[PDB]
Amino acid sequence: PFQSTLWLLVGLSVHVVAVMLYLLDRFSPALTLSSAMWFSWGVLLNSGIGEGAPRSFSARILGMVWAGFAMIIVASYTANLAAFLVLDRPEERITGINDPRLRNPSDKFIYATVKQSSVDIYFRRQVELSTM
Amino acid sequence: ELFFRSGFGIGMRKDSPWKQNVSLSILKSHENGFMEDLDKTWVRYQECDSRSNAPATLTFENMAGVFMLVAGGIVAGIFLIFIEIAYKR
Amino acid sequence: KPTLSDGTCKEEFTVNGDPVKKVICTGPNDTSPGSPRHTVPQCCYGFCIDLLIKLARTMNFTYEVHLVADGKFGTQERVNNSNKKEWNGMMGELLSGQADMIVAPLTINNERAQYIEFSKPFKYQGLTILVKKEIPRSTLDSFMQPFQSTLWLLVGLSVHVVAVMLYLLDRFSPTLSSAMWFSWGVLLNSGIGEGAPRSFSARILGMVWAGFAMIIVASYTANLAAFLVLDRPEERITGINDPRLRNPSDKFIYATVKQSSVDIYFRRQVELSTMYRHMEKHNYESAAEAIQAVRDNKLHAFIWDSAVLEFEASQKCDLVTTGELFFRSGFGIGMRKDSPWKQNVSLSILKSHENGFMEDLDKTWVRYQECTLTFENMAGVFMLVAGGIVAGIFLIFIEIAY
Amino acid sequence: GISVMVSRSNGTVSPSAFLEPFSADVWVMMFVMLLIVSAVAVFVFEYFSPVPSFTIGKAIWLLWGLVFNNSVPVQNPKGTTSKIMVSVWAFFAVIFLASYTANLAAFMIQEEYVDQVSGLSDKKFQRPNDFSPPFRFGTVPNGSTERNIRNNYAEMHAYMGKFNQRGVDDALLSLKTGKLDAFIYDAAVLNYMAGRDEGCKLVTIGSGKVFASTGYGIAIQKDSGWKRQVDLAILQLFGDGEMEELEALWLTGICHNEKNEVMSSQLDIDNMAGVFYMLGAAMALSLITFISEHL
Amino acid sequence: CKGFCIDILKRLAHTIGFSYDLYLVTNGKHGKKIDGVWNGMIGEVFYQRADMAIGSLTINEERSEIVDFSVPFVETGISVMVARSNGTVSPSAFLEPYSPAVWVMMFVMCLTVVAVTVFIFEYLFTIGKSIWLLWALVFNNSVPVENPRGTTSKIMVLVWAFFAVIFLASYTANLAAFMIQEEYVDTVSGLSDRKFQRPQEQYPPLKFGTVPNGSTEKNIRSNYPDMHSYMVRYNQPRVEEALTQLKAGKLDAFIYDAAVLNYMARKDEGCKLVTIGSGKVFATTGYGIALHKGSRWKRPIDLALLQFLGDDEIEMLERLWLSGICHEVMSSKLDIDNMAGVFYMLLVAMGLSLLVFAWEHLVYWR
């Protein structure tokens, strides 16, 4: 459903968002660097591991928008997978005797019948179909 | 779609004494269910289905990477154990 | 448009900033609709007038524009005495000496080509049908479409019955508040409550109960994601040869404009005699009256020029066009057979086609206007929040008193 | 021939519509994979690492609560290598659940409906006095389609006496009202009425099925001299293709009753019956284990 | 010899009455000026070596000054045909399947409820711990959150929990409906695009060309001299030979008359060739039959051609000859470009966070 270049960017974006969560909270008037990493993965993968949470108000608002980016990416995944299962249908078939490929035949298309039968008589008395 | 509709028929020579009773046995056989019974035994036994839209069910062969992912990670943590204890040692 | 009290037309400007060009039109105020009327100067401007000023500068002549008296396009009618046939309308004034040229949309026909000489068409077009859009969108007023009222009657009963059992098995094994909060937590997926199935019997029922909640949500999404796609209340006429047109059903009323070229087209063919006589008693007098009838649902179809019906569709935005073009004949400037301007007019139209001049007249006067869930279809999901607040407040007073 | 008309409004929902996605393998063989990871984590990953007690019972509960969306209280283990294994399993739950929803939407876009009857030999027609409030059907008397039934199915001809319309136009009205459920008539007219009905609310049983194939004809006087010349004229029109044009001019309809794509559906108790009975097995599954838990 | 034009010729001779003898011309094609003489179906009529020149002839101004044409019976202009590209969707579909009013009203409900659930906790929990909880249920419970300890405060979040499921479940349903049926986004406009007028000002040099010695080249030379000099290096001697260049990936656009490109775009295997504009035509000039400038047959022919259009005889000839198959949506992977819309949502939040960080830091100093 997702191109291989997009998946590597999602994984790389987890570390970049998580790395400055520790910086943002610590400098402003405490969560360890390793404790912040479990927070980002837990939100994206919906797992229930870890307990570290942001403390600073500025740190909250970043770890709060990230929880909206996690739902969109999952929701878009299941909507596209519903497009590789219902949209696999081409359309190319012969439609009756009025199909253009029969009125004006080409050398690449070959059609025939059984010699000395009723279909031969049908194709003789009609002068419009004198080309096939 | 059908573009020349003309049925079958038993062919007989002109001035044939049987030309009337042959054409009256066929009409009766239609209304007695006899010719809707020969169709059942000789022409209408289904053997292979058709394509009603595109219904797809998922089997094990369809899901290989998903199940091998967890099976491919159960051994990844074993190597992690031999280095996690190395931190204390 | 009417002129000002002083006498001159209002000065308007285009979006870019180029002033429009207007002339003085001297026509009847109301084309005498049952009452006599005089002629009053007016203001004229549009596609064809903008084209007329281009020919005057190129071919170096002078003009004066006056509207048609009766207001029709042109057809051949028989005089009551004998079978003397004479034209009427804009086509009958050219032959009578009251006009030297016709700069207006005139379909190039065969009946009128025997009496006047047209020019190379300055716009290629065809005929098409106009209908009125119906059922603007799916209602979806109630969010309970996938699950009828019977489902919610016992789904809410299921959480209570499974809750009381969860209090039974664990208690009598080697309370109500703990069991009730846990049962509702799984169904709505809310991280509340601390009650856990310590006993073995309470675990096996809880694990199965978690499966039930996931199935209900999954079915809800699939139904809503499939009902939207399979939504097609087909009502299109699909142009001509539709069974509802060739064989009228006495409830489908369709007509066109009197005189014009559609009447000529339908009368010549003998296989269309069964449908021409139906609309012969419903034909209107002007295109503007037929458009208004469609909006008011007094008419169901309208057969007219594609170049005009495809401009009202993008402006009204309430009625849409449907079908396929079935009569290809462009417009043309009409002149008498003895006029000496025929060749120069036709040579001054081919040049404007290839100079890009007739693309400015299309961008300026034709192609400029183009008219989810939203607030509607989910008003029901909003009142429950307010209803929950109002209902909860009353119980809080009892809670305080308790 | 002979055909049967119905209302198409009731239809027939498809029960057990939730177990079609996946199969009996991916469901059953997922449990053993669940039991392997849980057993390995508790006895190896957690036991032989530093950093009250994390038994198997709480571990299986945790891994069971992630496949069915995180909804139940759980307890998380300690140690670095234990959380890595749990996190990976959470990435398997997202893929498993997301594909289930997407696949289910595919089956409910391309669903198929079945008729309530199969033909003129169904038990509803042959023996109507053994069911729920009886089936309603009837036909216009004084015709060929009533003479054929009166000779072959005389048992149900007596029951058809009460329901006897007096016109094809009137009978189509009672179908939309509810006064009768089936209409038995000739197949050359019922096909036209169904194809020239707004809203597509009338369909023919069997998608254009006949039961006594006898065409039309001209009733010349017996032993006439014009019969041979008329027959050769009719057979000439078929060769020139002048019969299909007449059908296109007169016998053309607009409703696409041939297409079986049902315009959406609403889930009801009968439609959503398997899910509740899935819980039905668990009603007594724990109760049976209640008695055996004492010993 | 047979075809669409020949069937017109037979009817005219039948309905009017005269005898003809067709013969192919060998000097040139369609007519051209070599500064003094004309070669082709125009020069023969000009030099009185014939009477009419039926076929595929375009009405022009330069030609109509020496010969007189007739009423056009087939429309024709200029169009551009390019290979079909990958299915392109709107990147803004991450937030599109909703309304601004829905999200404008989204936070007005929360702001009232967070105050109610906190104020009611006073009777028997900061505001910061209330927004962190009620908002979290909307995007599924995946973040640690504080919980109340009142037998009625738990009731209010149950109502909010019910609304959370409806919003999320409906959002993933509309997205599927939008990604199942849609329309392809076009790539280039007509001859007025920037890639044609000044092609040497972009890093990728667009490749286009046309068959010389015609009317669709005299149009370009006398209107866009800058484009004409660039097309000299890219020329093709036949229509079918030029089509293989698009198949082989050499060229990028082919400029030719509309009446032929449309036929080639329909009669195709797989239908991977499309015309820019979904049937866009520039410099609309139909076909016609050349005459002798005094041929005296002009009036009977014009009244004969206009009679066919009164009936539907010309329409039948179009269905018999000019008709093809595969006159749609594509299952395309998301890729970065289509999903780039939602990544900008996070970029603003990262920038916004720093400004709030500076606000708290500076006010604490004073």
Ligand SMILES: *[C@@H]1O[C@H](CO)[C@@H](O[C@@H]2O[C@H](CO)[C@@H](O)[C@H](O)[C@H]2NC(C)=O)[C@H](O)[C@H]1NC(C)=O
């Ligand atoms: C149509 O155009 C032609 C050519 O532009 C006009 O013919 C010229 O008229 C001028 C007027 O004095 C003469 O000096 C030229 O000798 C004419 N011939 C040419 C080749 O230029 C013609 O007059 C125009 N038609 C009308 C009705 O004015």
Ligand SMILES: *[C@@H]1O[C@H](CO)[C@@H](O)[C@H](O)[C@H]1NC(C)=O
């Ligand atoms: C056909 O049937 C009639 C009466 O049953 C009989 O008289 C006649 O002989 C039959 N035809 C032949 C060819 O036997």
Ligand SMILES: *[C@@H]1O[C@H](CO)[C@@H](O)[C@H](O)[C@H]1NC(C)=O
């Ligand atoms: C155009 O008309 C003017 C107005 O009378 C007159 O000088 C002459 O006919 C033309 N002028 C030219 C051709 O310069």
Ligand SMILES: *[C@@H]1O[C@H](CO)[C@@H](O)[C@H](O)[C@H]1NC(C)=O
């Ligand atoms: C059918 O025949 C009966 C008896 O002859 C008669 O009373 C009735 O009017 C006829 N028509 C219908 C429609 O029942």
Ligand SMILES: *[C@@H]1O[C@H](CO)[C@@H](O)[C@H](O)[C@H]1NC(C)=O
């Ligand atoms: C175009 O005309 C020139 C004139 O000399 C000729 O050399 C060239 O081959 C022609 N190209 C064609 C017919 O494609």
Ligand SMILES: N[C@@H](CCC(=O)O)C(=O)O
């Ligand atoms: N098709 C039938 C109509 C009468 C009936 O069905 O009863 C007939 O002509 O005999």
Ligand SMILES: N[C@@H](CCC(=O)O)C(=O)O
């Ligand atoms: N077929 C058109 C166009 C030819 C071309 O584009 O070269 C003509 O005869 O002029």
